[PDB]
Amino acid sequence: KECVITGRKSRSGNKRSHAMNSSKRTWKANLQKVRILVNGKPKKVWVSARALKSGKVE
Amino acid sequence: ANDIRDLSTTEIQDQEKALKEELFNLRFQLATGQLENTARIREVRKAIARMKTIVRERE
Amino acid sequence: MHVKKGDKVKVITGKDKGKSGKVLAAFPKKDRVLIEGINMVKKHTKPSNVNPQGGILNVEAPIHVSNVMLLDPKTGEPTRVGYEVKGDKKVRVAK
Amino acid sequence: DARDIIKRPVVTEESTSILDDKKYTFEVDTRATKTQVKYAVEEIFDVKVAKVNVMNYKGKLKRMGRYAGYTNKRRKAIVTVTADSKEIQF
Amino acid sequence: KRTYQPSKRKRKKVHGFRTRMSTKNGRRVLASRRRKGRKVLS
RNA sequence: UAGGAAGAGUAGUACUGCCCGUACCGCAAACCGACACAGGUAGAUGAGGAGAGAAUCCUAAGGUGAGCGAGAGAACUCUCG
RNA sequence: GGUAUGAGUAGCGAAAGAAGGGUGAGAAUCCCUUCCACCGAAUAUCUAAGGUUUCCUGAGGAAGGCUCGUCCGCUCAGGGUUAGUCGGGACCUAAGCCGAGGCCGAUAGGCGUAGGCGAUGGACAACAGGUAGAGAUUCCUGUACCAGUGCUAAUUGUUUAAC
RNA sequence: GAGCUGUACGUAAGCGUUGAUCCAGAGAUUUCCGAAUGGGGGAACCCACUAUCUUUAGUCGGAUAGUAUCCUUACGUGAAUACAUAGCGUGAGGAAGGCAGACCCAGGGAACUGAAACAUCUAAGUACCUGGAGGAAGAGAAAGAAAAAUCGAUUUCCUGAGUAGCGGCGAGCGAAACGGAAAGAGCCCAAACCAAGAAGCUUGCUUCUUGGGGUUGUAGGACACUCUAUAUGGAGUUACAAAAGAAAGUUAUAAAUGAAGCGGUCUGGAAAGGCCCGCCAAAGACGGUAACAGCCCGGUAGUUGAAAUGGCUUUCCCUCCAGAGUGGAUCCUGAGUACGGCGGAACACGUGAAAUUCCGUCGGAAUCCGGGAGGACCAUCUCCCAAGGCUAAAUACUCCCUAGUGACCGAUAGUGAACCAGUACCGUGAGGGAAAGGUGAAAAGCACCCCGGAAGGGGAGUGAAACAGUUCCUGAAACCGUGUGCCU
Ligand SMILES: [Mg+2]
Ligand SMILES: [Mg+2]
Ligand SMILES: [Mg+2]
Ligand SMILES: [Mg+2]
Ligand SMILES: [Mg+2]
Ligand SMILES: [Mg+2]
Ligand SMILES: [Mg+2]
Ligand SMILES: [Mg+2]
Ligand SMILES: [Mg+2]
Ligand SMILES: [Mg+2]
Ligand SMILES: [Mg+2]
Ligand SMILES: [Mg+2]
Ligand SMILES: [Mg+2]
Ligand SMILES: [Mg+2]
Ligand SMILES: [Mg+2]
Ligand SMILES: [Mg+2]
Ligand SMILES: [Mg+2]
Ligand SMILES: [Mg+2]
Ligand SMILES: [Mg+2]
Ligand SMILES: [Mg+2]
Ligand SMILES: [Mg+2]
Ligand SMILES: [Mg+2]
Ligand SMILES: [Mg+2]
Ligand SMILES: [Mg+2]
Ligand SMILES: [Mg+2]
Ligand SMILES: [Mg+2]
Ligand SMILES: [Mg+2]
Ligand SMILES: [Mg+2]
Ligand SMILES: [Mg+2]
Ligand SMILES: [Mg+2]
Ligand SMILES: [Mg+2]
Ligand SMILES: [Mg+2]
Ligand SMILES: [Mg+2]
Ligand SMILES: [Mg+2]
Ligand SMILES: [Mg+2]
Ligand SMILES: [Mg+2]
Ligand SMILES: [Mg+2]
Ligand SMILES: [Mg+2]
């Protein structure tokens, strides 16, 4: 579950209350399942919205 | 050992068979309590090993 | 070891110092030697063994090698041993 | 080879009691099938084998001064030769 | 009726060598018993 | 049926048939209970008289006399009349 | 860790023994005989599990055995388990488990398709006698069955096609 | 270079100067399980298929080889579907697993505890799990540190300094630069542009591959001219391109040689000790030997030595290679990047006035008249040129090997383990986890007699000693007894 173009994926960090209690959470990448052809043949792969912004296959 | 190297492979192969037949008979006599010279067994085993070593060297 | 079976040794330490004998056996793993007529012990032997009348047998027991010196047939005295090569094999030499 | 498969004869009151019945008891290689034993015995002794019965003996636990361990596992083959077949000697 | 009702099969299926090897944590156990130098893994 | 096919069956004859288990205990002193432990341990079989019966009492086949004993016959305790 | 005290005390774990004979250095306790007594839908006979040599024979009596011990499930030696047909595998699948690709997921992995594994179930050919220190539907005798194989003999088939 | 067939208390049969046993280098053999890989499996088992050979009258047997999965990559076949793709097959390469319970980098990440309670904070980015490794890793040739006016990659140590700071401004946390040292080393791309294809056909323009070129700040390069090189020189497998060999030296892995007292005498079981004489010493290390040895033995100093294998160092081979100057028409100099908002994290720095660095998300430059930093921010000045990569040494650690050391332990200590110990034993399992060293110099390990079934004793003998008798140096105390001087 990772951007095939970039490598964007889940990363951990803290959620913080007011009062500054911390608890672990993640930041997921905005991955979208799309058909592209990294290799000649097309295929449905995870790609980040950020990677799609501009010039990709679709 | 050097005398073994004088022989042909086929001739060595025949010497092995002869030694294996001898070793079998020794073990058979040993089992039936008829051997006496029990030191022959080790001699023959070594000889067989010597044959098979020379032959593997040939290749 | 500086001596071996057959050697004529003088004994330089123990109840038997001054006595000489022939080396009947060497035990290089124990670093001991068996000298003829030296270190006699009385073995209380049961009949069972090769000895069909048993009895108190008087035989030689082994001495420590460092307690005997080699006898040079020329001088007939205890000598330390050197090693000199003739050509083929090396040989013991007196000093 | 055949003399690998047949290890040694078995000499016991039981083994010796059935020699007259033309049944010969051998200790055979632990991997040897009774078919391999049949053809080995025929090669070695020049006899016609009627049947081979075979049994596995597990190792027997033996002590020797606070050291304990198992004797070798054995495979025992009883080889019955035919009426017409020549005997094995022992 | 006591705990411990022996079964040859259940012993090997739950604790045997191949069951230990079949999981990563099972392999940690084998590695740990080898490290301690146990005569008997599994 | 699709397929594959010159060999097929029938009779007779003799030959061939591997590996693992097989001992012994198994209501038990051998299994599970630290014990030669009044406990626990699936299934098959489980005779006769009287009886509905595998109940009950006495027996058959078969198995057993239980790994401390000899006296004594007080209090008391337990189990009984 | 050793050794006391309690103390020669509690206990010796459900139960019927007896005498004669034997063995032996030694006998309530081992062997034999006879009588007595107990279980008998079991305390009998098989057998699965489990145990793993405890089985048989010959020696033994330190320790173990709640006493004793000449005896033993104990010690030491030798021995002992035989299968085409019994049970399991070279057959089958259930629950369940694994699972090529696949799907999912910080890592590790989780799930799952084909496909496999997996009896507690399905399928599948041997009986009666004998023998015995220790195995027996396994050994032996007799009489079988199942699946194959070659070898004889006829028989039929050899491209509208036996099988 | 004379014995040997391991322990260990055997019996037997044998071997060895025609050189054994033994030591070192190199080979061969190396069952089964295990990633385990032909399929399966309850590890150490079961069951195959395909070739080739072998056996039998044929089944039945035997031998050898191949046969996992994934990735990459050739080639071939090849659907819905016409081309084709997927799929399927074959052949090459490669991976897989383990571990030094260490060190290193990354992903994920506690709590007890401290704060005399506790929530921010601490513990701590610790323990632990997972992945990746390497002999080290990481870092690294400035969009740096500064502002004594200059320095010149990184890392590590000393110092700065418990300073500046951070902080329920609590508990606590806590730098950096300068200065001094160890060690030192620098390089390659991307892009302009050139050539050659290849394709798209935008059809003479554009983007794709290979090669050349080119690597940087008051700029460098391309591009114009110009001078010299095209192996003259130079450089290499530790970056800077990458594989190969030789030879010589040296080190390692066995060994060899090696001085001087049987000196006298005393005690003693024994002399290495005492007393009295000598001697060697580049050797008076250590150990052994019947008590304490430079001169008895193994040795030690010194001096020699290697058939074989491995390491290292050189040299040769082999391989590879353009580098100065002058202009500044134009062109190039890393884009979903830098940066910003929002949410987190890392920075000693807890969102703060919060620079710097990273992550998610959304927005989103300039691009030489350009860009970044100097702790909000602007201006000036100064120093730098990001969004690509590589790079030894100084540093960390030790499962190991070799040689040594210790005002370290000496059997309840020291390892859990001096001894067949991760054993026995306990536990379904993960896991937990002991106890236990000493005869003597030498077995000379008690012939023989006596009591006893034996055990065990008493003699006799061995021995310095047996009150050293096969667990046997010493042998305290508790505790158990016998005897009896005084008392009851
Ligand atoms: Mg069988
Ligand atoms: Mg248990
Ligand atoms: Mg039976
Ligand atoms: Mg019971
Ligand atoms: Mg019940
Ligand atoms: Mg009866
Ligand atoms: Mg009392
Ligand atoms: Mg009382
Ligand atoms: Mg009482
Ligand atoms: Mg009782
Ligand atoms: Mg009843
Ligand atoms: Mg018995
Ligand atoms: Mg007793
Ligand atoms: Mg007995
Ligand atoms: Mg199912
Ligand atoms: Mg299925
Ligand atoms: Mg199955
Ligand atoms: Mg029986
Ligand atoms: Mg039969
Ligand atoms: Mg030699
Ligand atoms: Mg396999
Ligand atoms: Mg507190
Ligand atoms: Mg000397
Ligand atoms: Mg004297
Ligand atoms: Mg002394
Ligand atoms: Mg000494
Ligand atoms: Mg932020
Ligand atoms: Mg912070
Ligand atoms: Mg700024
Ligand atoms: Mg952002
Ligand atoms: Mg900035
Ligand atoms: Mg400022
Ligand atoms: Mg500041
Ligand atoms: Mg730049
Ligand atoms: Mg200790
Ligand atoms: Mg002590
Ligand atoms: Mg300890
Ligand atoms: Mg003692």
The residues, ordered by sequence, that sit 6+ positions from E21 with a Cβ below 8 Å of its Cβ are E27, E30
Q: What are φ and ψ of residue A55, in 5° steps?
A: -120, 100
Secondary structure of residue B48 in the 3-state scheme = helix
Secondary structure of residue D9 in the 3-state scheme = strand
Q: Are B24 and D8 in contact (CB under 8 A)?
A: no
Secondary structure of residue E20 in the 3-state scheme = helix
Distance B42 CA to ligand 9 centre (A): 69
Chain D residues whose CB is inside 8 A of the B30 CB are 8
Distance E6 CA to ligand 15 centre (A): 27
The residues, ordered by sequence, that sit 6+ positions from D73 with a Cβ below 8 Å of its Cβ are D30, D56, D57, D58, D59
* D3–B30 CB contact, under 8 Å: no
Identify which of C88, C83, C86, C92 has the alpha carbon closest to the alpha carbon of residue C7. C92
Spell out where A1-58 has E strands: 11-16, 22-27, 31-36, 43-48
The residues, ordered by sequence, that sit 6+ positions from A50 with a Cβ below 8 Å of its Cβ are A3, A6, A8, A29, A30
Q: What does the DSSP 8-state code read for residue B59?
A: -
DSSP-assigned beta bridge partners for residue C82: C93
What long-range pairs does E32-39 form, CB within 8 A, spacing at least 24?
none
Structure tokens at C60: 């030689």
What number of other Cβ atoms are within 10 A of residue B12's Cβ?
18
- Tokens 């000499």 map to which residue? D11
> E7 beta carbon < 7 A from strand F?
no
Suggest the residue from B13, B24, B38, B48 to mutate for an interface test with chain D (most D CBs closer than 10 A). B24
Nearest CB to B32; choose among D3, D7, D11: D11
What number of other Cβ atoms are within 10 A of residue C78's Cβ?
16
Who surrounds ion ligand 2 at CB < 5 A?
E 4
* Structural domains in chain B (count): 1
What number of other Cβ atoms are within 10 A of residue D78's Cβ?
20
What number of other Cβ atoms are within 10 A of residue A11's Cβ?
9
> E8 beta carbon < 7 A from strand F?
no
Domain residue spans in chain E? Answer: 1-42
Q: How many CA atoms lie within 13 A of E22 on its CB side?
A: 9
The answer, for D8 touching chain B at a CB cutoff of 8 Å, is: yes
Q: Are C3 and C9 in contact (CB under 8 A)?
A: yes
Sign of CA dihedral C46, C52, C55, C61: negative
The answer, for D3 touching chain B at a CB cutoff of 8 Å, is: yes
What element of type H or E holds E16?
A: none
Ligand nearest to the CA of E2: 2
Structure tokens at D41: 């015995």
- Tokens 């399942």 map to which residue? A33
> D80 beta carbon < 7 A from strand H?
no
Domain that holds residue B24: 1-59
Identify which of C8, C9, C24 has the alpha carbon closest to the alpha carbon of residue C61. C24
Q: What are φ and ψ of residue B25, in 5° steps?
A: -65, -40
Q: How far apart are CA C94 and CA A30, in angstroms?
A: 97
Residues in chain B: 59
**Experimental method of this PDB entry:** cryo-EM
Identify which of D3, D7, D24 has the alpha carbon closest to the alpha carbon of residue D88. D24
Amino acid A13 CA to nucleotide H146 C1' distance, rounded Å: 36
Minimum-distance nucleotide, CA of D36 to C1': H61
Q: DSSP readout, D48-66?
A: -EEEEEEEEEPPPEEESSS
Structure tokens at D90: 């022992």
Amino acid D66 CA to nucleotide H481 C1' distance, rounded Å: 37
